[PDB]
Amino acid sequence: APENLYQAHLKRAEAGVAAAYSVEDYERAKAADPEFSLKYGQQPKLPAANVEKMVAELQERDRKKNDRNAHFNKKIQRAF
Amino acid sequence: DRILELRIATPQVILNYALFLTEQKAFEDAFKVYERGIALFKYPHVKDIWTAYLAAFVERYGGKKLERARDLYEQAIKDAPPTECKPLYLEYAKLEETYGLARHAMDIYARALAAVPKAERKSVLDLYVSRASDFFGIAKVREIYESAIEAEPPHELSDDDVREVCMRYSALETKLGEIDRARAIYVHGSAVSHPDRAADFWAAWRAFEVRHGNEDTFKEMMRILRSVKVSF
Amino acid sequence: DKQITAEQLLREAKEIQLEDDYKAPKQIITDPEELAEYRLSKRKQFEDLVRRVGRFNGGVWVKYATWEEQQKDFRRARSVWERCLAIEYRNVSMWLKYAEMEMRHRFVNHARNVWDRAVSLLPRIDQLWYKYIHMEEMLGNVAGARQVFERWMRFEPDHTGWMAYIKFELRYNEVDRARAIFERYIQILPTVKAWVRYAKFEMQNGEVGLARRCYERAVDELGEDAQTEEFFIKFAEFEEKAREVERARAIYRYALDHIPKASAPSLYQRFVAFEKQHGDREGIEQVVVSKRRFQYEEDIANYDTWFDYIKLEEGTGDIERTREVYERAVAQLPPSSAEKRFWRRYIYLWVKYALFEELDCADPDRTRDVYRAVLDLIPHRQFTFAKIWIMAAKFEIRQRNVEGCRKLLGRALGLCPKEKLFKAYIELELTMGNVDRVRKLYEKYLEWNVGAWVRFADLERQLGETGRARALYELAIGQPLLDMPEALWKSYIDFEIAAGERERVRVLYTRLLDRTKHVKVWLSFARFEATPSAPARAARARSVYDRAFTTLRDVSPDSKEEAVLLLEAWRDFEREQAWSSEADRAARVSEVEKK
Prior knowledge:
This is part of a larger assembly, with chains A, B and C. Chain A is an all-alpha fold. Helix content of chain A is 70%, strand content 0%. Chain A has helices spanning 4-20, 23-32, 49-64, 67-79. By secondary structure, chain B is mainly alpha-helical. In chain B, 78% of the residues lie in helices and 0% in strands. Chain B has helices spanning 2-6, 11-23, 27-40, 46-61, 66-79, 85-98, 102-115, 118-135, 138-147, 159-176, 179-192, 199-212, 215-231. In chain B, helix 2 (11-23) runs parallel beside helix 4 (46-61), helix 6 (85-98) packs antiparallel against helix 7 and helix 7 packs antiparallel against helix 8 (118-135). Chain C is 76% helix and 0% strand. Classes of the chains: A mainly alpha, B mainly alpha, C mainly alpha. At the A-C interface, helix 1, helix 2 and helix 3 of A face helix 7, helix 8 and helix 9 of C. Chain B: Belongs to the crooked-neck family. Chain B: One of its GO terms (biological process) is mRNA splicing, via spliceosome. Chain B: It is found in: Nucleus. Chain B: Its main location: nucleus.
């Protein structure tokens, strides 16, 4: 369900902000950067670790995760 | 109220505060604090303060505040899980029988069996039937029986339970002298009863037909039990 | 010994394992130029499959592109994803797999570009926007995540989109930004959900005058269509956890005023839940009782809830209220004049109002009024409630209106001839000691009855008119209408035995034996002869038993159980005889037995 996997997307959002970033991290990145506009496109100054964070984060997700006639009926006893 | 302010409380101090104002006969604040505590926790820790509050109202306002009594009961019902609607439904039936009217107590028990688990619906149905005997008699108890026969799930009662329901129904119908309705009830219980474990059911039916049945119905006995022995 | 059912053979066929294919042998493969040509082979395989099946059935470009990603060839895999999307760009699954390939290999500007395109082309798939925002905040790029949230808000998402934006700005403890989003949110989707969520945000936030501000602003801005249940439920709960309960009472009322009372059940039960704690005892009692009254007022627009309201008012002390409630319950005449249950219920409810005016109201004039209303609304020529007459008579008797009770009794009599009414009236006539009117009433009940003659004889005996009572019993025996009464027979026998007359009882016994040959009657005659010289009594009892067995023999050749019971009783009494000799008891028992 989009509501089910939506609260699971918020699971992932709040979990990953609790897991990969901190408030002084964020606020000193900002303190270096006055524009938090019209700067769209230009990549922002952030630590090179951040990248693998995302990658590792999603890769984390990863480790959580006759012949054809058997499947057919196995749909029907399922249903019938 | 400082303990209740910070939510460091349990059923214990709720009950304690409430009784302490009960003995200073401050029943009104006891009631408001019961209101505080009931929402202050969820069950099964709200069962005990609910028992105390239910009793504290029953004791003091019987016959004068029946409407708010049933207010209390109804909200206690809709917060309580299926696991303990039994004692609360019993309290509600008891008061609205003693001070109230038998008809809405009848519908009380109807609600209870509609609401309690199958495995104890047996002991709740015994109560419903006996109270209906006291207050409405023959046709009403018969309708209780058939209400306990025609209930498709999730109203489901157990085959051994429905077995002895059918047993009681025939034992009372043969009592009143309308034997063939009890014949019908036994045919009903046949489609539920695998014979091999329930020898008492078929024993009652057979020795029953020996006194009220004929050899045509006896061959239909060895035809029905035949079919069921084939069926399972 | 075992036979051939199907299924087992089918299982055997399954065991025969078909030709599921054996895995290709894992020959060791060198990495250089043996790799490259395996890659040529598998890429030509993919290009062949893709020119065949690629366009018409999806699935294939994902395999091709994940393989090229396994080869760590991302120029090639990006071209495979671009050829998927050149076929069908409206598939969100493909945009997701493309951008995720790009993300999981730290190609983050490439991923941003895929997201920009996916989110430009399908701006109505929320999930694209979510995953773009998520990718940006996983890189700790919250300015970029926020700019994606701004673009998304431009495409006007649902409540969940604006709520996710607000939660985003909260996650970085930016409550000024989240507040500006709430401003925009409640403007864009102007809703009760928008406003109550705004106010929940504020009451979490630290601001309670602002949460009040946002409810107030919801009713002014929202204006119309802020009239609804959950808006007022939320107003109530807010001002409740603000401990402004007078504010909350104003809220609950102004609601019930404005809300269509069709919508009122939940709001009103929750208001009851408010008064649960904060109200006063008789205050909340007033509230619930009033609401019950209108409940019944609409439900009659039902005798059991009627009696229940009677009980509620009577227990609440409100006397005039209970009077008016009984009045309204009697205002509902039975529309179906045939159902004895409903008319009986109506009579019991009016009798309940009667006992309320009688015991609780202390008004005997109002009691006479209620009972006379009951007497006039009950169509006696069809409806026969002796109970109403009896209770009215008791009321008139306690008040000592003797002639009044007599009038009401004669009224029920000349209206609906009733054995129970007549018997109670005669009881009450004996309770005054007016024996002559009692005789006249017994007579008028007889002319309209074994017990009428029986009660008249018993009265004459309780007056000592044993001769007059004996003549009355003789007349009772002489009429052809009460032919086979054994109960009046029992009464006459009892009067003859209590009157010292064994001989009158004997004449009665001869008449009773001549009349009906019952074996129990024969036993009773001989038993009367038995119970208190004693040897003469035993001898007379024996003569009776012998004549009885002889008669039941010559009259009842099949009725063996009758004479069998007779002989059983005979042997029992023969063993029970106070005999001066036990050998005589043995011989007499043997004589009774051998027969």
